[PDB]
Structures are given as C-alpha cells and as structure tokens.
C-alpha cells in the first residue's frame, strides 16, 4: 500500500516551505554583522556601546 513517510516528509518540508524568509534572515544579518564591525572597528563610537552594554546587563 502506500508508505506512510509521507505524511513525516510533507510535514517536515514545510518548516521551509516559503524560503523569502531564509533570504531576507539572511540579508539582514550580513547587514547588521558588517554594519556593527565597521562602527567598533573605526572606534567605540560612543553609542554603539550603549546600545551592547544594556543588552549584556550585569547582574551577580
């Protein structure tokens, strides 16, 4: 009769179905990575530091 992988396999594409959010997932990091590494890389800019230094917190 039939196999039932079928039913596995259909549902275990569809985590990916519409790829258009792999793509722009990806070009938004590309973005963000080099975009970030060349603020720092110039100097501490003395606002990208804010924004990284609330997002670390400190806590005990």
């Known amino acids: 009769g039939p196999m039932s992988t079928t039913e596995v396999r259909e ?3 569809s985590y990916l179905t519409p ?3 792999e793509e722009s997932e990806s ?3 590309a973005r ?3 975009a970030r590494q060349s ?3 110039t100097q501490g800019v003395t606002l990208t530091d804010l924004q990284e230094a609330e997002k ?3 806590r005990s």
């Open 11 to 13: 549902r275990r594409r």
């Open 19 to 21: 790829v258009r959010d």
């Open 27 to 29: 070009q938004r990091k």
């Open 39 to 41: 603020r720092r890389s």
């Open 56 to 58: 670390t917190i400190g």
């Open 32 to 34: 963000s990575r080099q």
